Amino acid sequence: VPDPRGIIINLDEGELCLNSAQCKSNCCQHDTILSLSRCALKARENSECSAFTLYGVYYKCPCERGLTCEGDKSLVGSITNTNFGICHNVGRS
Numbered sequence: 001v002p003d004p005r006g007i008i009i010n011l012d013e014g015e016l017c018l019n020s021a022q023c024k025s026n027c028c029q030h031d032t033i034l035s036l037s038r039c040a041l042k043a044r045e046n047s048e049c050s051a052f053t054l055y056g057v058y059y060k061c062p063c064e065r066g067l068t069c070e071g072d073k074s075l076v077g078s079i080t081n082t083n084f085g086i087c088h089n090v091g092r093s
């Protein structure tokens with residue numbers, strides 16, 4: 001009996017997900033506070049990205065391989081959870 005098989009993951013983007021660690025592209029995308037979440041792709045250069053990640057669903061997914069999330073301010077009259085950085089090519093050498 002080779003150890004307990006609890007790691008049942010690997011789902012493509014465009015399908016209904018609970019957390020972000022279930023899809024192949026680790027990005028369960030939140031439909032703005034309502035919580036009906038569907039998987040998506042990671043962010044590209046000059047797009048909004050979440051600089052920290054939890055064990056769960058994301059409002060703006062993190063940056064691609066070699067690019068950083070630039071999370072310095074982004075609070076132009078803040079009431080909801082709308083505070084995000086921009087993807088740029090700093091995390092390489």
